[PDB]
Write a protein that binds this ligand. Structure first.
Ligand SMILES: [Zn+2]
Length: 228
């Protein structure tokens, strides 16, 4: 009865994700961080798997399908996305809300992240949107509660290491958080659009520090869960 954790490095292939002022691509940065997290979790006896181990495009639903196929106890998307103002900064963790965004920045990023599927030509029909809302509405309460707890465990560990954009786990209607049963969060490691954070994201030490904080968060979460 080993724990399975599925890590989704956001973007990939033709989807660069956000690009920093000095040209860094989210997709490369988050693959590096995701791999680091995997290693640490496996060193501690958790069966951690990637939705992609190379530079590949994956549709948002397929990322969640991979979590389901592997029987995940936990699913985590890792990003480093953008805002239109270079001054937005700090790390975030998000869980689902089907009712409405908890913050303006949650609402902004859920839209930006959810439109990643468009890079492949596939603009979302109304019928697609209806199916999303229905599916978000079906997510269990315990799932969302557990994702919020996971989220506060991760923020607790990031906080001593790097600026938080928000002290709480925020919520919005992220497609990759649509699993009814698997606790799911999306982690923003920084804003790549902030020049200082782009620079940090460009360093092995920072990527390692951030990945360490994320893995400690997961581990801390499993500890809490087992004590209940
Ligand atoms: Zn992203």
């Amino acid at each position: 009865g080993k724990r399975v954790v599925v890590l989704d490095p956001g973007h990939g292939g033709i989807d660069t994700g956000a690009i920093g002022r000095n040209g860094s691509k989210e997709k490369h940065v988050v693959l590096a961080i995701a791999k680091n997290v995997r290693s640490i979790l496996r060193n501690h006896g958790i069966d951690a798997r990637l939705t992609r181990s190379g530079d590949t495009f994956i549709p948002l639903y397929d990322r969640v399908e991979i979590a389901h196929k592997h029987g995940a106890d936990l699913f985590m998307s890792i990003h480093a996305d953008g805002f239109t103002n270079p001054k937005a900064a700090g790390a975030s963790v998000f869980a689902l809300s089907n009712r409405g965004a908890s913050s303006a920045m949650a609402k902004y990023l859920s839209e930006r992240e959810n439109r990643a599927d468009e890079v492949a030509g596939k603009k979302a029909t109304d019928k697609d949107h209806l199916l999303q809302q229905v599916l978000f509405d079906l997510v269990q309460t315990d799932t969302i509660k557990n994702s919020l707890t996971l989220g506060s465990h991760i923020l607790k560990k990031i906080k001593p290491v790097h600026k938080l954009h928000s002290r709480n786990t925020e919520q919005a209607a992220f497609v990759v958080l649509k699993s009814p049963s698997v606790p799911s969060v999306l982690v923003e490691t920084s804003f790549i659009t902030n020049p200082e954070e782009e620079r940090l994201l460009g360093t092995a030490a920072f990527r390692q520090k951030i990945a360490t904080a994320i893995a400690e968060g997961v581990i801390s979460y499993f500890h809490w869960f087992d004590n209940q």
